[PDB]
Amino acid sequence: EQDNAGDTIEVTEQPIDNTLYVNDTGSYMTTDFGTPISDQTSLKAGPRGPTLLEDFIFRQKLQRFDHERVPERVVHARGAGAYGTFKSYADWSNVTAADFLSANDKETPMFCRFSTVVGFRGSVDTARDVHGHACRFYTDEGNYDIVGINFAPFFIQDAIQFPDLVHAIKPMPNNEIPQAATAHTSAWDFFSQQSTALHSALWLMSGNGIPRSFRHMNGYGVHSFRFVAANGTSKVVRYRWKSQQGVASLVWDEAQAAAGKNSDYHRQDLYNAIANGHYPKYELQAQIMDEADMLRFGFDLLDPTKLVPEEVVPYTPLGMMELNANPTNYFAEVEQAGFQPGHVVPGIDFTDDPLLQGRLFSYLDTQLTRHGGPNFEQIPVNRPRKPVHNNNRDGFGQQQIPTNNWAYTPNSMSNGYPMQANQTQGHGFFTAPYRYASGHLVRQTSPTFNDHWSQPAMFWNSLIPAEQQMVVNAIVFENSKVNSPHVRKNVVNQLNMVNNNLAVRVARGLGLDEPSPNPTYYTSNKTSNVGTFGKPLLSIEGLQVGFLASNSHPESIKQGQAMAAQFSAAGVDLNIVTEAYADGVNTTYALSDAIDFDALIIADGVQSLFASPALANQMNSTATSTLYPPARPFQILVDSFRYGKPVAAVGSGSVALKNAGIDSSRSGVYTGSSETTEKIAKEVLEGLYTFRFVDRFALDE
Amino acid sequence: EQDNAGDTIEVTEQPIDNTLYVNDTGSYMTTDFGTPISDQTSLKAGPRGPTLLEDFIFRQKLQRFDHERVPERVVHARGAGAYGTFKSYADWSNVTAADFLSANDKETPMFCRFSTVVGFRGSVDTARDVHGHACRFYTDEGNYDIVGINFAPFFIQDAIQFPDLVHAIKPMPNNEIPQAATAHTSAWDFFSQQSTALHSALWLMSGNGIPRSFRHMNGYGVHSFRFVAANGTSKVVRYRWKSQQGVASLVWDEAQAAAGKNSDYHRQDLYNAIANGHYPKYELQAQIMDEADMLRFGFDLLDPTKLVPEEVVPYTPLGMMELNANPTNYFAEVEQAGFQPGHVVPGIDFTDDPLLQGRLFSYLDTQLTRHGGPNFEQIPVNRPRKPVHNNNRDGFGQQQIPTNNWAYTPNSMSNGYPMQANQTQGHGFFTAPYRYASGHLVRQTSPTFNDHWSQPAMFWNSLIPAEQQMVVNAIVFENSKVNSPHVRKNVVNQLNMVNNNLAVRVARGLGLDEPSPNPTYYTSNKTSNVGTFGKPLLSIEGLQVGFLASNSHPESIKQGQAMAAQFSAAGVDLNIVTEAYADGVNTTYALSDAIDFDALIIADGVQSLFASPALANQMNSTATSTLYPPARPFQILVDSFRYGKPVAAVGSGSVALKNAGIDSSRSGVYTGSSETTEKIAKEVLEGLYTFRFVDRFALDE
Numbered sequence A, B: 001e002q003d004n005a006g007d008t009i010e011v012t013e014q015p016i017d018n019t020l021y022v023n024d025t026g027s028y029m030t031t032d033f034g035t036p037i038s039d040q041t042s043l044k045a046g047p048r049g050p051t052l053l054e055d056f057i058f059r060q061k062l063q064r065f066d067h068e069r070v071p072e073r074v075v076h077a078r079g080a081g082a083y084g085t086f087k088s089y090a091d092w093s094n095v096t097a098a099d100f101l102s103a104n105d106k107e108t109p110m111f112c113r114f115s116t117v118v119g120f121r122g123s124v125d126t127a128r129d130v131h132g133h134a135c136r137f138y139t140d141e142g143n144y145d146i147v148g149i150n151f152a153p154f155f156i157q158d159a160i161q162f163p164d165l166v167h168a169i170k171p172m173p174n175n176e177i178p179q180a181a182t183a184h185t186s187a188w189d190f191f192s193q194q195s196t197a198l199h200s201a202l203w204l205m206s207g208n209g210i211p212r213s214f215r216h217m218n219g220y221g222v223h224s225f226r227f228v229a230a231n232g233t234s235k236v237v238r239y240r241w242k243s244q245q246g247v248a249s250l251v252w253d254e255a256q257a258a259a260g261k262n263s264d265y266h267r268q269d270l271y272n273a274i275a276n277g278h279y280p281k282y283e284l285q286a287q288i289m290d291e292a293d294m295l296r297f298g299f300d301l302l303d304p305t306k307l308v309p310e311e312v313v314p315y316t317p318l319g320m321m322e323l324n325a326n327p328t329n330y331f332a333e334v335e336q337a338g339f340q341p342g343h344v345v346p347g348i349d350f351t352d353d354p355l356l357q358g359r360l361f362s363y364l365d366t367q368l369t370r371h372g373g374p375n376f377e378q379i380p381v382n383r384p385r386k387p388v389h390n391n392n393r394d395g396f397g398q399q400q401i402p403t404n405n406w407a408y409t410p411n412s413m414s415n416g417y418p419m420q421a422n423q424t425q426g427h428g429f430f431t432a433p434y435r436y437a438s439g440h441l442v443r444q445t446s447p448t449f450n451d452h453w454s455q456p457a458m459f460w461n462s463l464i465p466a467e468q469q470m471v472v473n474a475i476v477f478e479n480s481k482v483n484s485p486h487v488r489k490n491v492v493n494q495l496n497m498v499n500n501n502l503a504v505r506v507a508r509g510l511g512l513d514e515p516s517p518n519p520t521y522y523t524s525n526k527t528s529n530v531g532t533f534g535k536p537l538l539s540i541e542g543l544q545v546g547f548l549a550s551n552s553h554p555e556s557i558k559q560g561q562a563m564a565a566q567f568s569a570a571g572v573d574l575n576i577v578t579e580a581y582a583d584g585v586n587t588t589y590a591l592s593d594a595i596d597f598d599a600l601i602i603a604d605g606v607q608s609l610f611a612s613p614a615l616a617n618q619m620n621s622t623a624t625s626t627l628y629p630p631a632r633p634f635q636i637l638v639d640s641f642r643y644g645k646p647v648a649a650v651g652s653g654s655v656a657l658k659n660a661g662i663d664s665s666r667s668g669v670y671t672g673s674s675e676t677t678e679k680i681a682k683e684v685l686e687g688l689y690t691f692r693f694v695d696r697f698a699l700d701e
């Protein structure tokens, strides 16, 4: 660049302020251009006069405000994030050249966001939905994102259908009803006309659609990807994030109650858990398969509507992630984060999964919408941990200052920088070299993709009877909300290709004719770890206990408080509830509901709070408590029991149980005198692990 | 423009397609550039091959999809719209030169949007909140927008504080919790440190915060505006939209239930009412005051925290609006609509209200954010009904084609077009000519604005005892959710400057020390039409009745059906509810809740459905119905009664009432034999007008 005076360029770097995190301590307010200000009164022509155009303080403040909002994500708008770390279990170089997997105990920084799918930005956490599980590894060789969900299969087999699925499940276009729900004609029409959807539709109707929290679901990559070794050999892999807390879910009416009582239930759960030191963990696992396995198992590994059963190919544990810090600013870090499945690193490659292939286009393009311009990767949360060097330039919102004035390749002026990186130098990305294609250029679906029903059948067989009833109840609920009889009937006919018992039970729920067995795709096969009831949690850290006490019986508070040490030691929060705040009280009846607690304990001597609605109704007007709605304590109890949660009662607390028709002989009901509270606590710990007592759920066939 | 050949310009208008409403009937799918396509399979290198970059069909479809979203409104994101018409009661030219008010029976097209304030796009309709009431008159002299709310006063006195109020009430910035709610430290901190907020805070805690529907609230302009007559004389006016349905509201726990059962409760209500021919009406009214009235009434008419009591200045009816059509496409017409208080027409002017003055800047600027460019008024819903002519040009998304090549004033080339319009020619806008200012250029608040407490006191005195209890319960609920004791105490102290009884009751609810009377700002004054309980509705059209029946007692359905004619004739929807769809059934237990009905009727012979939760709990597992959660029918009944709704029972239905502890002697409880169903219906019509039976609500002091 310097064989002459003209092309020789003097660089003078200016001492520009380079703040990242903003710290207000000690400061006076300034404009964005650094002039010290107050911001509390408009400049006016006299104190009762009109506001002046020259009040630039007013205009800069309101212009910022008027422009705060950005487009939400077209899908997964409602979500929450956290930072963490990932530790490799091994040097995996034998199967992948990926750097974050290259050594035992190698640690990589992480950022993840969890979300629903269909609802808009402020929709209810406990909507029935798919849930996103999207994690970025900030590796030494680039940001690697696994952008997954809590179900193993997806609804469709080609990315070109994605706007069809999404418009179908989103609110109707004429009136934007209903919010965050598939319970409408268009969605079930789509799922029944596009029968690839059945597998994921069953997942959605199961407890998987309504998880207890982000900490109590698994994550799946869904698609086949490739691990590529340094020498070019590849393996076909499928990812699972196995929650180290375990898998647990709500029941529908409980998910509804939670939506109305605490729309922030899952984001609050994640925030509180991290803030309280109960850091959620998920183990990265992969089914590591050979190229020869593409069609071996009787379905196609390119097909995203199909899971590989653990019993056919086991999951190999790769390493452990932990999320251990909350974001500092939600808008800056969470709202602006843009995950992309095309954010790959050397040692990872794609497959010809037609669903995956289109996602690679879509996510890069969509980042423009939400960020207003092309420099979205420059936002701090999206930056790689090492500095970027390439010949990309300019664009709205450019906050870097390139010094390489020869921004093209090949050139003879820049000393070869930046250098081309590839398989054999600079740890460059490379497509797996044995990949091959051969064929006409076709817009045709592979016939290997044609079985839409067998895997739905396996999934059904994989659920305990209580959760099978839950699926029926959900399908019946959603298809009763569907307004079109012909769609209802199409759904039944589709379900009958999956399992006759399922379809008959649904048709009965809908008041429709019962179909007859259609055995073509039926199977008795089943797989494990795809249900959400009947298997206990692996950790009860960060779960909640509600201890129902009264200010009118002061010893009840003290009884609550003496149990607190035991729960604290298990990482369980004990919440003492009374009518109103007082010494030792944590929360109140008026603020409380069953959904707020994972187990409930009734204190000794407070039985009189637990009047049934019928009793409440006699004495109305005067001398009924104003401090909470009529029969609130009773309702918390009855709801907790109905939902399947452990309930305990100390002393005369058992009177409350009887009032509620709860026999002390039921599973997950613990009783004891005031002298045995220590043992009652440990039984509650026991019940928290079991989590739900499914013997309480009504069964049909 | 043509005294020479060079400046003479040939205009050739091209036959360009000019579709507005899109009609698909008969058509093949095409790209946006008109090439006929299919859109169901990606183009691949072989049927199991990778997707090709040259598949432009895939890319155009996903690029559209990837870019569907736009920024939501910074406030009032959650809302719903409808078209209608406005009829003037008179020629009002004696007080205003406004054209839409210039003749008896003069009709003007309308479009309105109603909304909450704090929640984001998909937040729950029944959040406790301010509600927007924003209406556009498409006049012959421009689009006139009244951008109002359902409360008479606003929280702050200067527009520069608007981002402070909004950041305070919106979710916290670190974690974006909580959604659509003021129940957190920051909001109550703001309301207590910025004590102007007390008036609107009391409105918010009343039933006004939780209306039954958009049809059952009023609208207020809040600010003083001016009517300006042709000759320059002005009047100071305040607007009210008086609902012709009447004012009705929910109770808090009911608003919560509705949020979890039907997040679309208000938008669905409005959509259904219009679709069913029950068109909501609101009468435009104005307090028409003299310039001399600015300080006469012991507060300042420039002050938006102050209402003028109807008893001091009556509302003059101006005309009647009716909303009579749903939008065709929600995104195009509702989401994109941009109302602005600066959208004024000749005969309307502003005042020096410092809150109003800033809104004039803010709304014009904010339209850029949501529309991506400056041509937001070109969107169909924002267009005036007559063609625009001005010298504004260009900008993103320009879909017009100007023919005037001399786009500046003054010029000698364009034949004087377009002509300047003013007070005396072309019906031009004009500022009211007697307006005057005089003063230093000051950033100071007017001392006339200093009384923050007297009007809050009047408002409190204006509520029936039951709604006063509702305010206390709300304040106590929200301030129990506030995590900061010092903020709780500040709120109490502020409330004690308003009314000692109010403050003592709140402090009791919060477990705080009771303050002592602080009489400086106390008053016994009261005003009418500012409460939401204790005054019946004026129309029951579009309200809902739930008729609880059973498939296991088939005559119950027929009993329901024979009542339907009477409800239909009142414009009331009768919904027959059973376990599952069948001949004559409208909805199901599993889909139903108390919030779905405004009155409940229990059929003869179905009492066995109405088992209490206690009874449900005995027989669990087998032979409990799978068709709805345990004790769902009972819960609907108990909830309806608790909320204050009319309930009726035919025949042995009274057994259900007894089970629920509801005596047939209570107000708003109707019973009769199977032979008197006609009379039972008319009593239910009676109860619908009364709407809520406040004798059921617990009272304190």
Ligand code: HEM
Residues within 6 Å of the ligand: A072, A073, A074, A075, A076, A079, A113, A114, A115, A131, A132, A133, A134, A147, A148, A149, A154, A158, A159, A160, A162, A220, A221, A222, A223, A304, A337, A338, A339, A355, A356, A358, A359, A362, A363, A366, A367, A370, B062, B066
């Ligand atoms: C296996 C199937 C899929 C999974 C597991 C998946 C996963 C996800 C996740 C987890 C998010 C949220 C990321 C975040 O938290 O910010 C997301 C967003 C998105 N997805 Fe998907 N997705 C799938 C299929 C598709 C398909 C086929 C397309 C389109 C071709 C697509 C387009 C999008 C878009 C446009 C976004 C918005 C991203 C943004 O604005 O940053 N997805 N997806």
Ligand code: HEM
Residues within 6 Å of the ligand: A062, A066, B072, B073, B074, B075, B076, B079, B113, B114, B115, B131, B132, B133, B134, B147, B148, B149, B154, B158, B159, B160, B162, B220, B221, B222, B223, B304, B337, B338, B339, B355, B356, B358, B359, B362, B363, B366, B367, B370
């Ligand atoms: C008397 C007090 C006020 C009332 C009655 C009021 C009313 C409303 C209403 C009804 C909307 C929703 C319009 C729609 O449905 O699209 C709205 C939006 C808005 N308001 Fe206000 N407002 C008030 C105070 C303010 C103040 C002081 C400011 C700022 C200086 C402000 C800024 C905004 C903005 C930026 C929007 C978004 C508008 C859009 O994106 O189109 N408001 N307001």
Ligand SMILES: [Cl-]
Residues within 6 Å of the ligand: A302, A350, A351, A352, A353
């Ligand atoms: Cl492949």
Ligand SMILES: [Cl-]
Residues within 6 Å of the ligand: B302, B350, B351, B352, B353
């Ligand atoms: Cl003025």
